[PDB]
Amino acid sequence: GIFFSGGLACNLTVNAACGIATTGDDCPALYYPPKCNVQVDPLQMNAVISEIANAINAFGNTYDCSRLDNLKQVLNRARNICDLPPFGDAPDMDDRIAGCFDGQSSTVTVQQLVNLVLG
Amino acid sequence: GIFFSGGLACNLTVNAACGIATTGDDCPALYYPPKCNVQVDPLQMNAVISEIANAINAFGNTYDCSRLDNLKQVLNRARNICDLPPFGDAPDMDDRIAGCFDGQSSTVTVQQLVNLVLG
Amino acid sequence: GIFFSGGLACNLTVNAACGIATTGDDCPALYYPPKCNVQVDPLQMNAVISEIANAINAFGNTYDCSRLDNLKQVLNRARNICDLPPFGDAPDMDDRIAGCFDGQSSTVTVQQLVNLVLG
Amino acid sequence: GIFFSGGLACNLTVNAACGIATTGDDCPALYYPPKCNVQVDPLQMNAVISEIANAINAFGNTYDCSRLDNLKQVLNRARNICDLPPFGDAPDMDDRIAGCFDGQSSTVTVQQLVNLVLG
Amino acid sequence: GIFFSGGLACNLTVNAACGIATTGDDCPALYYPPKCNVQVDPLQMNAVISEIANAINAFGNTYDCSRLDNLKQVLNRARNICDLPPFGDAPDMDDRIAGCFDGQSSTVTVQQLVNLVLG
Amino acid sequence: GIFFSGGLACNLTVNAACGIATTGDDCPALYYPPKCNVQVDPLQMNAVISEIANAINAFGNTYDCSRLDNLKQVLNRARNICDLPPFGDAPDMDDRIAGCFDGQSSTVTVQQLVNLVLG
């Protein structure tokens, strides 16, 4: 993947953060050694570029290199609620509604809210 | 941008994801070729560095080089509802509320909310 | 960090974001100069790989090297609300409810909604 | 002396300790970089030997080459209040007595305990 | 920890105090072997100097790089019960007072003191 | 011991503390020289490890490898009274009690305090 297959572990180099949960040993977390002669692999830069690009094209947005801050816009559209499309239908039985309940962000049902507002 | 200037298409190389949406026939989707004497372009790497840096500075946060998870904290603050600051005033009849609706995550206006609860 | 150590300022190269907010002179924003006798520093690349790895690992997701849209799915799960876990405890009076307010992505306490719905 | 002259900062190394309160700015909490072929400076070891020797020499004790628990003995002498010298003459009313009052180790005036016992 | 990773057992070397109590076999106590081709691990020296730094900041005192007696000063402050903070409120029966009883440093409550003196 | 076997006098090098009390000249205090290169002796580092580890295990505590503040905890255990265990029997007239007297960390026996109470 984005990891150099002929690489090392975290404690065997620098600027490498281990503890990377992976879907098995076949895609191990390996990094470049701290030598002055090794060269960055192009067929890894491809994977990093693919990651960033697939991130940018999320939500239907389109990439554009005239703006070096595309991922910033994607993050903003990911957090800002307003960006969400208005619910084009009348509300109903238990359409869950989100919020920082008791400290943890989670969702509650409609009936759970009417239970407290009826009281 | 972040793509290689004289690269190839998606299917002529490896670790190259296509379906990338770009604006116009310029700024195309070109990745590194699988050849022996191709090295990663510094100017092209500057684009990736700038994209990551601008992704870090979302939400006004500042980037520190000592830690290797700034993007993780930014992406956490994205989903952490509790992050959202309190609203400076009282709501009204037209404001929208976040929430899911039959697998159609959206917003609901206080109008239909009060209409359903008043019944 | 992810910036090139021996690099130049943003305005002295190409594809270099300007105005990146660091956390002090300690971590300066420097990019690869437009010269020829310069190669991508493997350690600087380790930094970027680690950043993307942490971003993928966020939200309890695991990395897969067979897919090139991991960060994209992480962003989608960040935006989607039904991905948020359901809540079991009864919402006390002082919870938070999120939604649009005067064109702003914020939240209000349950007090505001109940006092409005009284009317 | 300690805090190796050409060292890095808190997170840039391994096993570093953070938060180090230092008089002035020219005495930075530095740590050996974790790279290839770095050797610890003799002078630093000289400073650490000086610190440990002064700590052992404290309380008027002397150092022994045949014993490897001198600092432990000095720490024991710091505790075990029975090593403190007796008071030569009769005490006065404004003296202070040590005790752990309401879960915090403090001192109280003799007048207070006399008023308490007379009650 | 501050021990050497690939060191030897307690009695297989010199200048080793063994019987060291550690939490868990996972991190044993291993000392540098007596081989002429071994170099001290700079990470281990980082751990040692980090321990000394954490110790030197105790009691609120800050570290000074110029002067070299600091651990002696902290130890003196430890055996300086005169430097203890005076109590603001009045002690009660449930409070504790320390002294040398039957030769051992221990504590007793003020209630025992008044019971003894009233007899 | 923790000194350098083939070192020089304190005044001849830097970062060296002079006046260190030792049991005779057979255990001299010597330091690494600033002149022609010398590598730190691994056995001397073993001695320092031994000293620190013995200091940690005092007061019945055990060494931890996950964190790096152990000596700070030990120094907190010193100078903190009530940690001192309570006395099983009743305070006899002969025993001594602690307390700062005339600005001196001295002790006084129960006879004098009982006489002050009765007087």
Binding site: S5, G6, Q39 | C36 | - | - | - | -
Partner: protein, 50 residues
Amino acid sequence: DGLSCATPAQSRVVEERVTDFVNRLPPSTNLTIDQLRFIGLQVLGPSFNF
């Protein structure tokens, strides 16, 4: 890594030589990266990525 850029003869002889070197390494001696890298350099040339 990087051995697929060379002709099959060079790849085969480099693998044979590195196997031979590691198998004949005396006890109590470090297996450094520089030695394997020299074995590869002496066959592939000095401007080869390996």
